[PDB]
From a paper:
These enzymes contain an N-terminal ATPase domain and a C-terminal Toprim domain common amongst replication, recombination, and repair proteins. Here we identify and define two classes of OLD proteins based on differences in gene neighborhood and amino acid sequence conservation and present the crystal structures of the catalytic C-terminal regions from the Burkholderia pseudomallei and Xanthamonas campestris p.v. campestris Class 2 OLD proteins at 2.24 Å and 1.86 Å resolution respectively. The structures reveal a two-domain architecture containing a Toprim domain with altered architecture and a unique helical domain.
The truncated XccCTR construct, in contrast, yielded crystals that routinely diffracted beyond 2 Å and three independent structures were solved using SAD datasets from platinum, mercury, and iodide derivatives. These models show strong agreement with an overall RMSD of 0.42–0.44 Å and display only slight deviations at the N-terminus near the mercury-binding site and within a flexible loop containing two adjacent glycines (G479 and G480). Residues 374–387 and 458–463 are disordered in each structure, though present in the purified construct. The XccCTR derivative structures contain nothing in their active sites. Similar interactions are observed between the domains in the XccCTR. In contrast, truncated constructs containing the C-terminal region of each homolog (XccCTR, BpCTR) were each monomeric by SEC-MALS analysis. XccFL and XccCTR similarly can degrade DNA with Mg2+and Mn2+ but also are partially active in Zn2+.
Author numbering: 390 to 458, 464 to 600
Amino acid sequence: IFFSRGVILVEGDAERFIVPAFAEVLNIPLDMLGITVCSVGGTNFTPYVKLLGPEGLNIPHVILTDRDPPLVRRRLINVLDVIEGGVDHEELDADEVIKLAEQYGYFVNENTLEPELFAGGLAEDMQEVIREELPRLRRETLNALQQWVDDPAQIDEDLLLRLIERIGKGRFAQALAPSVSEDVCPAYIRSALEHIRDAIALEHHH
Ligand SMILES: [Mg+2]
């Protein structure tokens, strides 16, 4: 599925459907542009940067990953060792590695996708999906849910992810996609979308 002009590398199935939804409401048409969202099924991006980098197919691509408080430092040294020659990156600290990696379109999200979405403006639509998909939730759990809608700081993050993972991370994102709007888009996701869009448009411009 790689007759692609570009590739967006994501960790799992939630981003594989959330990121295309956010691209539409940002008017970045990924399919029209020939851009694939490819889930790497975890946090190892190195085989895929090898594949798309200069010593592979040399195809424009971006990375979207979580900070994980961090593991992201080694995760990004690994891809930077590929895309940046035999340059040494060992002497940089995590922050230095994160800001270097942005030049190549690799963006780090602090915290994690679904909680961030629930705090930052999608709380009430997520509760709605959760209840359509888990219709016989105990009343103790429905109330904890409403406790977080009323106040996205009362959030039990582990339970939220427990429910979503029970629904299915891909399936839950597919059902929340109709709800995303431009102003609730996380910044790292907008940065990756713009970076891959720029690189494709810069090619057409010569
Ligand atoms: Mg992660």
